């Protein structure tokens, strides 16, 4: 049942006497029993990818062959916990070893077996009942926010022979006994699923519901949807980590799986410190955010091979909650660090590289990862509906959107949130370029917007036309010097500035821009566009008369309005609720309309 | 009838990426097919890439995960992947390997065809002539498509190339003075797009004549290497044996090229530009050229393959080699898309080789050829004027430059811009062409003979 | 008399097509006839050489082409000219060769364009801007040359 280590080249270990080993089986390498996974088979020798530092591993060390592939333990006890790249809980390690360092070769159960879970059966099953994969036969109350559905694992079925009565059970007991054809199966609350295999769904459905983002831009102009996939290929300093963390804090999803794959250690601590202090009311009661989130830490200074396990562990967890009828919006804040791990391993393997040193199969890995997102009809008699969204960062070197990872990613994701380093230098956050970005879900959500708002869509169009016209002008204005500009063009240029400075950017570390409810975004946009139309009409109807209302005339006459328009961001939706914000915006619109009547 | 029992081997030498290497094999046949039974009972297939002595390298289509080097059983079929084909494959949806995905039965083997293709004698090839009236002014006017042509649609990521291809399929037809069968090969296509085409065919009632082969982005990346060969093999049966006219759509040859690159790297082949196999040119030619008409038949195959252009360039080896093989392109651009123009097709870098012969008196209108050339030159100049204006300003242009700028803006608004649910005929397209040409005084229309101008220009 | 070979034909025949054509050309040259040989493309021939060079796992040169690409082109291009034929009749024939370099661009760094330019005496370059303006035939008139001026002056 053992092989022996033949050689070590770093993250890749070669072992012998493993003739019967299959690809993607787990092994235990060394006397510390380090976790690894077989990549290649050459005769009776195996190529092992090791997820822990290989320093100190000797030739001749035993290698245990484990039949089970890389897999994730799925059951109650996930929410609120932080995991490493292979699902070893960090709060349980630190509570057991008393160390500050993560030891190598730690064998810790993914889910604690001491917790007595509150379990209630569905009360709809009886002995002799026929149950199939995805069926729910009870719920465990992990906390007050997420109700943890106990599902019959996929690839399992049979007749019920026993169901545990309602009561307090831990993860080592038997809750459901079912039999199929003589063979009987005993299930606890925890199921095991290979992390590289996609959990099966009844049907993949189109995404027709917004994924709410606490941002003005990245929502009004480039919407994302529940079940959609987006990329943020920002250069360092562009603020893409802040966008991802902001989306996690303030969204309309039920569960967030945050994957820190190659991220700085300080960023994962920031989540652990800040999240417990955040609130989201459920039904009149104040509750913390952490009870509905989970996160995976595989920091930059951890084993590079573990970066692949982290990405797949994250999405696998996301699917599990998807299957329970929750809307999941997981985000891996790196992607490039995963592709980087593939490059480093491919090198040690002496594989033939493709574009810029990356493996030829890079596109294959990214495509199959992102396609696990989507709104689905779940398997299981209870007819659940769920989704997994993926918001993945990319780290192009130099900010040049030409590397194999950014290029391949853009061909996969349907929403492109490109960031511009030159906007971040000006602290124009979020640093969204708004010229190269796009969203292919605009048409999908047009139905939603018409039902709830109507006014939003023509405002979105007018705003894009203004921004595009300003860019078309800036290209030539830099050369002319604002000498040949018509009065109608100066209005575009100045209103476009109004939009850029007050609407597209917001300071996410303030009490007023930390969250921007959608109704506020469309409200203040309506005023800015209404000003545009009134200012443009004012000059268009007077330019041919005996007194043309040029920018300098409207600017001096309405200078108070232009300042008020810029102040519209400072509304603090937590202190001043919807009623005050709408009344304030409505009053400014009336004030403007009266100013034009006295002007023209 | 090959009534000879098959050999099954457990003599696996090793597994490396998508490739499984076998030893101790009796008289290996090149490009043979091997059925793999994994220790857990999973069945998968693969095709031999090379043989040497008692060794063979097998390309596993469904994937190699789970294969060991001791128990996996490898059954050699003794033949080349000849696939079952039937005239009643229309109205069916298959996966990337030609298996049912639509809850229907396995296709009944009316006959078998070697998917590698049987070369057609150029002496019996019939030159295409008849125009297909696609409904899209950017195509029917300038870069017309003949039936039997090979005109791929290039695009970069994010552009509406799936909508244009769908529009052509439902608006396809001939210039009149009955319809096409569709063979749709999806290679690396996401689920949202797959449902886009599947629903569009159903909503228009076309499925009665559509055969889909779906290899999705979440499906195996080796399988898609045969997918395009299975699609064209069916097209060849339907067009050359069943006297049908078949329009073949290939959703992305770029994901196909990537699949070849993955294999090429896995077998440590010497690459050419950007890591792709040095034989990319040949492997594409053997797929693209499965088109056209043959003497003695009434059917035809028209191909309109789609290619995603990495980094929005057109020098990438994939579109570079394709351009050398296919008879022009459409080339969907991004600058038109950013301006909310649909279809965002850029007429300048896109040509149609058969255009010079598929138009003119007896096929469309006497003036077709002259209108196209004049519009092209005017547009090209307008872009050179725009390039100058961007530097010198609108106040530094002469009267003629302003005419070309006026043409440029009106050309894209009135001629190119159409909408996905409106079709215009070739004759309506030319009438619009004239409306754009009549912006200029006749003296500036230097690419139209005076005889043509006198007949049409003053109307 | 044409020689027909399409892009979907085997790479070995794609390479040999040029050799077959010139062999027929020389055959009639030795009859005292003036033979004019038109190539469709020499980039397709060079492409065949690149594909085979890779398959043979021999060390490439620029842009993946074999380092001996120039030697193959010289062998083809130098099999031409007005000659005194072998045989008692003292007859004199000729072969003219018109090559065809498909332009990946106007940059003559292209290994095939560059090797051809160093060999051929007459180069009729086709301007991209004149083609875009539908000025036909499209000839640059500035980058083209013909080295037979002094020969034809008589």
């Amino acid at each position: 049942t053992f092989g022996y280590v033949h050689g070590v080249s770093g993250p890749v270990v070669t072992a012998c006497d493993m003739a019967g080993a299959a690809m993607y089986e787990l092994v235990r390498v060394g006397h510390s029993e380090l976790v690894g996974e077989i990549i290649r088979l050459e005769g009776d020798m195996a190529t092992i990818q090791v997820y822990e530092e290989t320093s100190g591993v000797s030739v001749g060390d035993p290698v245990l062959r484990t039949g089970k592939p890389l897999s994730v333990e799925l059951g109650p006890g996930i929410m609120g916990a932080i995991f490493d790249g292979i699902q070893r809980p960090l709060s349980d390690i630190s509570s057991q070893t008393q160390s500050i360092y993560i030891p190598r070769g730690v064998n810790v159960s993914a889910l604690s077996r001491d917790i007595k879970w509150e379990f209630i059966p569905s009360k709809n099953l009886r002995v002799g009942s026929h149950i199939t994969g995805g069926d729910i036969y009870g719920i465990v109350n992990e906390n007050s926010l997420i109700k943890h559905k106990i599902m019959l694992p996929p690839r399992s079925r049979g007749s019920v022979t026993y169901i545990a009565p309602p009561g307090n059970y831990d993860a080592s007991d038997v809750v459901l006994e079912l039999e199929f054809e003589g063979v009987k199966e005993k299930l606890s609350m925890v199921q095991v699923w290979p992390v590289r295999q996609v959990r099966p769904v009844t049907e993949k459905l189109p995404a027709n519901h917004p994924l709410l983002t606490g941002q003005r831009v990245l929502d009004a102009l480039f919407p994302c949807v529940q079940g959609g996939t987006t990329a943020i290929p920002g250069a360092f300093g562009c603020g893409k980590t802040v966008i991802s963390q902001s989306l996690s804090k303030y969204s309309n999803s039920d569960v967030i799986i945050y994957v820190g794959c190659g991220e700085r250690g300080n960023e994962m601590s920031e989540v652990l410190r800040d999240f417990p202090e955040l609130t989201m009311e459920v039904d009149g009661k104040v509750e913390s955010i952490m009870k509905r989130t989970a996160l995976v830490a595989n920091t930059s200074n951890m084993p590079v091979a573990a970066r692949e396990a982290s990405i797949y562990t994250g999405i696998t967890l996301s699917e599990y909650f998807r299957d329970m009828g929750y809307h999941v919006s997981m985000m891996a804040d790196s992607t490039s660090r995963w592709a980087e791990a593939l490059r480093e391993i491919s090198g040690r393997l002496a594989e033939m590289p493709a574009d810029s040193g990356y493996p030829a199969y890079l596109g294959a890995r990214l495509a199959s990862f992102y396609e696990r997102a989507g709104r689905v009809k779940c398997l299981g008699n209870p007819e659940r509906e769920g989704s997994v969204s993926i918001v993945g960062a990319v780290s192009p070197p130099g900010g040049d959107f030409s590397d194999p990872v950014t290029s391949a990613t853009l061909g996969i994701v349907q929403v492109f949130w490109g960031l511009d380093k030159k906007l971040a230098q000006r602290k124009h956050f979020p640093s969204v370029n708004w010229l190269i970005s796009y969203s292919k879900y605009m048409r999908a959500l047009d139905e939603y917007y018409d039902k709830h708002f109507t006014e939003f869509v023509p405002l979105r169009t007018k705003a894009k036309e203004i921004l595009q016209e300003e860019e078309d002008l800036a290209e030539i204005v830099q050369l002319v010097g604002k000498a040949s500009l018509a009065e109608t063009d100066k209005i575009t240029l100045e209103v476009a500035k109004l939009i850029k400075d007050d609407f597209l950017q917001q300071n996410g570390y303030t009490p007023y821009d930390r969250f921007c409810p959608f109704y506020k975004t469309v409200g203040m946009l309506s005023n800015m566009i209404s000003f545009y139309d009134m200012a443009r009409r004012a000059v268009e109807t007077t330019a041919q008369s005996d007194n043309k209302i040029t920018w300098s005339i409207i600017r001096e006459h309405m200078g108070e309005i232009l300042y008020k328009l810029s102040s519209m961001k400072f509304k603090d939706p937590v202190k001043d609720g919807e009623a005050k914000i709408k009344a304030d915006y409505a009053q400014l619109l009336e004030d403007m309309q009266n100013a034009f009547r006295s002007l023209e | 009838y090959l009534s000879q029992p098959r050999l099954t081997y457990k003599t696996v030498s090793g597994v490396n990426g998508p490739l499984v290497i076998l030893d101790h094999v009796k008289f290996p046949r090149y490009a043979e097919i091997v059925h793999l039974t994994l220790p857990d009972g999973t069945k998968r297939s693969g095709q031999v890439l090379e043989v040497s002595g008692s060794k063979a390298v097998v390309q596993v289509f469904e994937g190699t995960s789970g294969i060991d080097a001791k128990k996996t059983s490898c059954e050699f079929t003794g033949d080349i992947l000849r696939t079952p084909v039937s005239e009643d494959m229309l109205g069916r949806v298959f996966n990337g390997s030609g298996k049912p995905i639509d809850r229907g039965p396995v296709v009944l083997a009316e006959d078998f065809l070697d998917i590698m293709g049987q070369p057609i004698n150029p002496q019996c090839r019939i030159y295409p002539e008849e125009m297909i009236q696609t409904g899209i002014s950017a195509i029917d006017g300038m870069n017309s498509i003949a039936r039997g042509q090979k005109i791929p649609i290039f695009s970069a990521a994010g552009l509406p190339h799936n909508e244009i291809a769908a529009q052509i399929c439902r608006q396809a037809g001939l210039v009149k003075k009955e319809n096409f069968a569709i063979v749709f090969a999806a290679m690396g296509v996401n689920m949202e797009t797959a449902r886009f085409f599947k629903s569009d065919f159903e909503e228009n009632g076309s499925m009665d004549n559509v055969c889909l082969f779906l290899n999705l982005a979440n499906d195996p990346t080796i399988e898609r290497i045969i997918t395009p060969r299975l699609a064209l093999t069916t097209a060849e049966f339907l067009a050359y044996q069943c006297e049908k006219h078949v329009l073949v759509i290939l959703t992305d040859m770029s994901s196909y090229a990537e699949a070849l690159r993955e294999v090429s790297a896995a077998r440590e082949e010497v690459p050419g530009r950007r890591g792709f196999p040095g034989y990319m040119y040949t492997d594409l030619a053997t797929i693209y050229e499965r088109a056209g008409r043959v003497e003695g038949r009434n059917g035809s195959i028209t191909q309109i393959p789609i290619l995603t252009m990495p980094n929005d360039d057109i020098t990438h080896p994939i579109p570079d080699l394709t351009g050398y093989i296919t008879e022009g392109q459409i080339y969907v651009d991004r600058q038109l898309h950013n301006r909310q123009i649909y279809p965002p097709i850029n007429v300048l870098p896109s040509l149609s080789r058969l255009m010079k012969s598929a138009i003119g008196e007896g096929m469309t209108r006497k003036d077709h050829a002259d209108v196209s050339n004049q519009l092209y030159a005017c547009y090209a100049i307008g872009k050179d004027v725009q390039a100058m204006k961007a530097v010198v300003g609108e106040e530094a242009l002469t009267s003629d430059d302003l005419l070309y700028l006026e043409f440029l803006q009106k050309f894209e608004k009135n001629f190119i811009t159409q909408g996905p649910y409106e079709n215009r005929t070739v004759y309506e397209t030319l009438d619009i062409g004239w409306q754009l040409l009549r912006i200029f005084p006749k003296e500036m229309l230097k690419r139209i003979p005076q005889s043509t101008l006198s007949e049409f220009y003053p109307r | 008399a044409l020689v027909a070979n399409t892009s979907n034909m085997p790479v070995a025949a794609r390479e040999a097509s040029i050799y077959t054509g010139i062999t027929l050309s020389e055959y009639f040259r030795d009859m005292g006839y003036h033979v004019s040989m038109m190539a469709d493309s020499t980039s397709r021939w060079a492409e065949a050489l690149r594909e085979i060079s890779g398959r043979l796992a021999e060390m490439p040169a620029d842009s993946g082409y074999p380092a001996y690409l120039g030697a193959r082109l010289a062998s083809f291009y130098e099999r031409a000219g007005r000659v005194k034929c072998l045989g008692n009749p003292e007859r004199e024939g000729s072969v003219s060769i018109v090559g065809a370099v498909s332009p990946p661009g106007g940059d003559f760094s292209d290994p095939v364009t560059s090797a051809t330019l160093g060999i051929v005496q007459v180069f009729w370059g086709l301007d991209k801007k004149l083609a875009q303006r539908k000025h036909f035939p499209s000839v640059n008139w500035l980058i083209s040359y013909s080295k037979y001026m002094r020969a034809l002056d008589e």
């Binding site: 002496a350 590289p353 | 440590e268 010497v270 | 796992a57 060390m59």
Partner: peptide
């Protein structure tokens, strides 16, 4: 350059195995 160098080294390695 990288890919070509590794190709040359792999060829030499194959040759050594044959001896």
């Amino acid at each position: 350059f990288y890919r070509l160098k590794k190709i040359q080294e792999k060829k030499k390695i194959i040759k050594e195995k044959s001896e």
